[PDB]
């Protein structure tokens with residue numbers, strides 16, 4: 001099989017055991033090569049998604065409070081309490097030795113610097129950035145898509161296709177609460 | 179099997195055993211790694227997860243109850259006295275299941291921590307789930323297995339987490 005060894009070469013990164021046995025069994029099912037169009041390609045796409053979602057991949061966070069404060073200042077003019085809370089959030093994690101990934105909600109009048117301070121924070125913590133907009137989201141298939149049995153199902157893109165930033169700790173901004 | 183030793187350790191009821199072996203034979207007509215396979219897999223996992231006879235021994239002792247209550251909280255002498263009265267009445271009656279206790283008062287007085295203190299005092303397993311405008315039953319009873327969103331619900335999740343047939347369930351913010 002041509003693509004089998006290619007997928008095997010791709011998934012060299014640290015994969016948990018359950019994902020690994022699932023992808024091994026999927027490789028074994030596709031290795032039968034029962035056909036070349038329909039049942040081959042559904043498992044092929046499942047395999048490509050499994051090998052594309054990065055497992056154990058991280059991004060070296062910036063632990064330097066001075067640099068984080070500097071870059072917040074470069075981005076925005078003084079949102080003093082906001083930036084103090086971001087720095088205190090960084091310091092509590094640097095104390096606990098491992099972060100907790102707390103959910104922070106920013107509320108206030110329009111145009112006050114809510115959405116862009118998120119990109120600022122992402123650059124400060126050396127994470128990858130990504131932006132939802134849940135307002136006007138009416139179907140659940142956006143956060144988690146349709147099962148693979150349906151014809152054109154996408155892997156619940158806005159969360160899993162998010163993970164194709166090659167990083168397990170990206171900062172995700174959920175835009176609104178409408 | 180994993181599920182077999184699971185049910186072998188704990189006292190299963192007869193109808194449950196019948197249904198689980200029925201669904202296990204229904205999977206025996208293998209439909210490997212599909213929707214109708216993973217549905218059966220999750221069903222049997224929840225079934226072997228639920229504790230069936232195993233429970234936690236209680237402690238209706240007033241002395242230890244008082245010690246726990248005075249340790250976990252400061253002040254609140256009258257609430258502690260009401261809790262001790264409930265415990266004594268429930269020891270007499272033996273059932274400890276008659277009327278539901280409900281603490282009310284201003285916010286921030288720690289009426290949610292009294293539930294944890296009571297769980298410690300009765301040596302039960304604690305569990306909390308809030309009801310703020312849920313408007314649905316799927317939180318309590320859950321969903322059907324047909325829906326792609328298939329969850330047992332708050333009660334079964336409490337049972338699977340506590341691994342105990344007689345836990346303490348706090349219900350927050352009824353009002």
Ligand SMILES: Nc1ncnc2c1ncn2[C@@H]1O[C@H](COP(=O)(O)OP(=O)(O)OP(=O)(O)O)[C@@H](O)[C@H]1O
Pocket residue numbers: 075076077078079109110111112113114115116117
């Ligand atoms: N303190 C600030 N310093 C520098 N630029 C700012 C500041 N506040 C707002 N801006 C700029 O003004 C624009 C306003 O966008 P903003 O991020 O405020 O949208 P928002 O707060 O999400 O508004 P809405 O809630 O209406 O969507 C941004 O492009 C931002 O660059």
Ligand SMILES: Nc1ncnc2c1ncn2[C@@H]1O[C@H](COP(=O)(O)OP(=O)(O)O)[C@@H](O)[C@H]1O
Pocket residue numbers: 250251252253254284285286287288289290291
């Ligand atoms: N008498 C007390 N002793 C110890 N902690 C208390 C006391 N009263 C309140 N608390 C604290 O208050 C917090 C819980 O507040 P709570 O009364 O549960 O608010 P709400 O009633 O709105 O849920 C807990 O962290 C608890 O430690």
Ligand SMILES: [Mg+2]
Pocket residue numbers: 114115175
């Ligand atoms: Mg915005």
